[PDB]
Design an enzyme around this catalytic site. Structure first.
Site, PDB file in Angstrom:
ATOM      1  N   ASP A 124       0.795  -1.218   0.000  1.00  0.00           N
ATOM      2  CA  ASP A 124       0.000   0.000   0.000  1.00  0.00           C
ATOM      3  C   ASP A 124       0.827   1.267   0.000  1.00  0.00           C
ATOM      4  O   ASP A 124       1.782   1.362  -0.750  1.00  0.00           O
ATOM      5  CB  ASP A 124      -1.014  -0.020   1.167  1.00  0.00           C
ATOM      6  CG  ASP A 124      -2.161   0.942   1.086  1.00  0.00           C
ATOM      7  OD1 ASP A 124      -3.115   0.720   0.368  1.00  0.00           O
ATOM      8  OD2 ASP A 124      -2.058   2.001   1.836  1.00  0.00           O
ATOM      9  N   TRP A 125       0.463   2.234   0.833  1.00  0.00           N
ATOM     10  CA  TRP A 125       1.173   3.484   0.881  1.00  0.00           C
ATOM     11  C   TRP A 125       2.625   3.295   1.266  1.00  0.00           C
ATOM     12  O   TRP A 125       3.462   4.118   0.906  1.00  0.00           O
ATOM     13  CB  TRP A 125       0.518   4.541   1.805  1.00  0.00           C
ATOM     14  CG  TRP A 125      -0.414   5.431   1.036  1.00  0.00           C
ATOM     15  CD1 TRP A 125      -1.776   5.310   0.950  1.00  0.00           C
ATOM     16  CD2 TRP A 125      -0.043   6.512   0.183  1.00  0.00           C
ATOM     17  NE1 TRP A 125      -2.285   6.277   0.132  1.00  0.00           N
ATOM     18  CE2 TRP A 125      -1.246   7.031  -0.349  1.00  0.00           C
ATOM     19  CE3 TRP A 125       1.179   7.093  -0.158  1.00  0.00           C
ATOM     20  CZ2 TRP A 125      -1.232   8.112  -1.231  1.00  0.00           C
ATOM     21  CZ3 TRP A 125       1.187   8.171  -1.019  1.00  0.00           C
ATOM     22  CH2 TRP A 125      -0.017   8.656  -1.563  1.00  0.00           C
ATOM     23  N   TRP A 175     -13.571   1.661  -0.331  1.00  0.00           N
ATOM     24  CA  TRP A 175     -12.523   1.937   0.660  1.00  0.00           C
ATOM     25  C   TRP A 175     -12.462   3.415   1.078  1.00  0.00           C
ATOM     26  O   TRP A 175     -12.560   3.786   2.248  1.00  0.00           O
ATOM     27  CB  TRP A 175     -11.206   1.468  -0.005  1.00  0.00           C
ATOM     28  CG  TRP A 175      -9.875   1.839   0.591  1.00  0.00           C
ATOM     29  CD1 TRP A 175      -9.147   2.962   0.385  1.00  0.00           C
ATOM     30  CD2 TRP A 175      -9.068   0.982   1.413  1.00  0.00           C
ATOM     31  NE1 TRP A 175      -7.938   2.894   1.045  1.00  0.00           N
ATOM     32  CE2 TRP A 175      -7.879   1.688   1.691  1.00  0.00           C
ATOM     33  CE3 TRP A 175      -9.247  -0.308   1.896  1.00  0.00           C
ATOM     34  CZ2 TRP A 175      -6.872   1.116   2.474  1.00  0.00           C
ATOM     35  CZ3 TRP A 175      -8.250  -0.845   2.686  1.00  0.00           C
ATOM     36  CH2 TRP A 175      -7.085  -0.132   2.979  1.00  0.00           C
ATOM     37  N   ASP A 260      -7.628  -9.117  -3.008  1.00  0.00           N
ATOM     38  CA  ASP A 260      -7.627  -7.679  -2.965  1.00  0.00           C
ATOM     39  C   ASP A 260      -8.358  -7.094  -4.178  1.00  0.00           C
ATOM     40  O   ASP A 260      -7.960  -7.375  -5.298  1.00  0.00           O
ATOM     41  CB  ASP A 260      -6.173  -7.163  -2.896  1.00  0.00           C
ATOM     42  CG  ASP A 260      -6.119  -5.699  -2.586  1.00  0.00           C
ATOM     43  OD1 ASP A 260      -7.101  -5.037  -2.325  1.00  0.00           O
ATOM     44  OD2 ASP A 260      -4.912  -5.192  -2.656  1.00  0.00           O
ATOM     45  N   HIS A 289      -6.134  -7.359   0.888  1.00  0.00           N
ATOM     46  CA  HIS A 289      -5.175  -6.263   0.778  1.00  0.00           C
ATOM     47  C   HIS A 289      -4.077  -6.231   1.839  1.00  0.00           C
ATOM     48  O   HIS A 289      -2.975  -5.784   1.555  1.00  0.00           O
ATOM     49  CB  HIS A 289      -5.960  -4.930   0.793  1.00  0.00           C
ATOM     50  CG  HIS A 289      -5.227  -3.632   0.614  1.00  0.00           C
ATOM     51  ND1 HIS A 289      -4.688  -3.275  -0.594  1.00  0.00           N
ATOM     52  CD2 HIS A 289      -4.941  -2.655   1.514  1.00  0.00           C
ATOM     53  CE1 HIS A 289      -4.124  -2.075  -0.446  1.00  0.00           C
ATOM     54  NE2 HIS A 289      -4.269  -1.694   0.809  1.00  0.00           N
TER      55      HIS A 289
END
Length: 310
Positions: A124-125, A175, A260, A289
């Site tokens: 992710d980030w 999300w 995901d 995810h």
């Protein structure tokens, strides 16, 4: 200078499976008076450093199952909490949070601690930001463990890295809606929805850093930054493509969380092609995810692949 607030320590008294001692830094260049928390586990004089970057809306807690595996292998493991999450301080204005504010913190951390022989662990980030780090000082980076993540490039250069924003409706759209809209955002409820196998105690560890909405500005801005990419973000991420395709010569291990709806195989296969020497990906069928939730396996398999080249 940057108005920030700090989560009361008692919020973390009762964490589940999180026996790691806190380490904090508050003299980082460019971040005056902001205290960042980070885990520093395993042998501190180790040759190999695993730098574990978390994403939205989590913290180093996310890596709790992987940390012990890496540490046991003889490596030092560094797992920082970004400003706005975990035990780090939390700027109160969404405007303070930017792609570069977070990326510069990472470069600051890396220098202050003088990390070398880094095995980058991202998702992710943690990956949107982390994959843009090696090109700034390639010598410190040696391996990469990539879980559901990609580059925040423009839609034209890599449509796969923009398509998910809009479809499916129950993917990124859902999300973001869950995160930015509620006036009373309950992180434990959000986590249980997006990581169905978490126990109640685990879910509560994700709510622990935020007593109330005033501690949640960073949480609120991350999704908007996926939707609205600023120019620095686009340029930096575009230039990172070149790095991975032509410049990268380290070892890579890729794991994909198959369930995901955001950064699954339709984002991961394309990312695999851009990373020079990336091997066949480890597909985890039951993982969503938050791949880290099935982390022991990812950690063990990656160590085996990397050892199979030393």
């Amino acid at each position: 200078m940057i108005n920030a607030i700090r989560t009361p320590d008692q919020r973390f008294s009762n964490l589940d499976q999180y026996p790691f001692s806190p380490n904090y830094l508050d003299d980082l260049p460019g971040y005056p008076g902001l205290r960042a928390h980070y885990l520093d586990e395993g042998n501190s004089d180790a040759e190999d450093v695993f730098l574990c970057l978390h994403g939205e809306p989590t913290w180093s807690y996310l890596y709790r199952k992987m940390i012990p595996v890496f540490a046991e292998s003889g490596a030092r493991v560094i797992a920082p909490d970004f400003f706005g999450f975990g035990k780090s301080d939390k700027p109160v204005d969404e405007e303070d949070y930017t792609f570069e504010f977070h990326r510069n913190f990472l470069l600051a951390l890396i220098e202050r601690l003088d990390l070398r022989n880094i095995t980058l662990v991202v998702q992710d980030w943690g990956g949107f930001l982390g994959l843009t780090l090696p090109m700034a000082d390639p010598s410190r980076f040696k391996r990469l463990i990539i879980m559901n993540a990609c580059l925040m490039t423009d839609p034209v250069t890599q449509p796969a890295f923009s398509a998910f924003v809009t479809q499916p409706a129950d993917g990124f759209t859902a999300w973001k809606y869950d995160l930015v809209t509620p006036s009373d955002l309950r992180l434990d409820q959000f986590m249980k929805r997006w990581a169905p196998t978490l126990t109640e105690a685990e879910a509560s560890a994700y709510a622990a850093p935020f007593p109330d909405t005033s501690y949640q500005a960073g949480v609120r801005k991350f999704p908007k930054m996926v939707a609205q990419r600023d120019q620095a973000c686009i340029d930096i991420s575009t230039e990172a493509i070149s790095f991975w395709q032509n410049d990268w010569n380290g070892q890579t291990f890729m794991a994909i969380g198959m369930k995901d709806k955001l950064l699954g195989p339709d984002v991961m296969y394309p990312m695999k092609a851009l990373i020079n020497g990336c091997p066949e990906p480890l597909e985890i069928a039951d993982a969503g995810h938050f791949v880290q939730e099935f982390g022991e396996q990812v950690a063990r398999e990656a160590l085996k692949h990397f050892a199979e080249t030393e």
